[PDB]
Design a protein around this ligand. Structure first.
Ligand SMILES: COc1cc(-c2cn(C)c(=O)c3cnccc23)c(OC)cc1CN(C)C
Length: 296
């Protein structure tokens, strides 16, 4: 369907590739043109969307995958629904949030993640899936104020019928800034699917912190900052992150003003339960979803 796509506007270009707003059948779509170095992400993401029933309000809706020719060279395209509001990362820098808006955002992420993490059997079945690169840049904002999780190019799958764990063959690794300590110290047990879910939870806790900083209380708010903004530079290294997270065992600071708001009080408690150095102690996505349903 790439041949019937007119690229209307490029919204991003980087080492990974380009993302375009396009029209297909006169409708808005998002087009990712992968870079040459990332074909295995195109393969894995295409594989996930074509072999698993992934329809969910909080998971980015897949439309099609294709190979096409431009500049006498092969381009790999992935096409998805288009979300006018863009990434949560960009959204948080353009606006502040009230209590309803903040909770709607984080609950929607928890619901998407819990849907990924659980295996469903029968007609609506899906294997359990871990994401492995959760971050606010990989979350889109919808018009109704909920979010949807995007990018399954690093996803790992597990199915109970076979007890089969399907890791990729993708040499891509997660975003370093969001890597849990067991990833940075390379002690993660790679043959146990729960390890990957617990890595997602660590990253979700960081996203929770990013979003809650932008919720207004007592007429004040924090500026947007990425996690560990104060202790690592942009494009942090493996050594940078490992020293902060593994040795010094640092966690994002809770701003004092959160404790004069009941909602940010509970969110601070929640995000800390995702950041335990011991991975088995972290909350599950279902437990996080349940709790976020109870806040307010
Ligand atoms: C099109 O494929 C994707 C598009 C986007 C995407 C990015 N930006 C910046 C957007 O504004 C946007 C707006 N609407 C819909 C989607 C996007 C994405 O989020 C990072 C993940 C994939 C999936 N895959 C290539 C990993």
């Amino acid at each position: 369907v790439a041949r019937d796509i007119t690229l209307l506007e490029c919204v991003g270009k980087g080492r990974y590739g380009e993302v375009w707003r396009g029209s297909w059948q006169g409708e808005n779509v998002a087009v990712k043109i992968f870079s040459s170095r990332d074909e295995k992400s195109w393969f894995r993401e295409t594989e996930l969307y074509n072999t698993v029933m992934l329809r969910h309000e909080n998971i980015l809706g897949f439309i099609a995958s294709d190979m096409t020719s431009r500049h006498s060279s092969t381009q790999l395209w992935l096409i998805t629904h288009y979300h006018e509001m863009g990434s949560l990362y960009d959204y948080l820098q353009l606006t502040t949030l009230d209590t309803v808006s903040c909770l709607r955002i984080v609950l929607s992420i928890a619901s998407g993640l819990a849907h990924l993490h659980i295996e469903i059997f029968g007609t609506q079945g899906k294997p359990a899936i871990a994401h492995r690169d959760l971050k606010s840049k990989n979350i889109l904002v919808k018009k109704n104020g909920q979010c949807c999780i995007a990018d399954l190019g690093l996803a790992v799958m597990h199915s109970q019928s076979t007890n089969q764990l399907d890791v990729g063959n993708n040499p891509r690794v997660g975003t370093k800034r969001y890597m849990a300590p067991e990833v940075l110290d390379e002690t993660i047990q790679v043959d146990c699917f729960d390890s990957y879910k617990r890595v997602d939870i660590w990253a979700f806790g960081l996203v929770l912190w990013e979003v809650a900083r932008r919720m207004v209380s007592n007429g004040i708010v924090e500026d947007y900052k990425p996690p560990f903004y104060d202790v690592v530079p942009n494009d942090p290294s493996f050594e940078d992150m490992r020293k902060v997270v593994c040795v010094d065992q640092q966690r994002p600071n809770i701003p004092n003003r959160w404790f004069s708001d009941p909602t940010l009080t509970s969110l601070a408690k929640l995000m800390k339960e995702c950041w335990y150095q011991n991975p088995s102690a972290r909350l599950t996505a279902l437990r996080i979803k349940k709790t976020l349903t109870k806040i307010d």
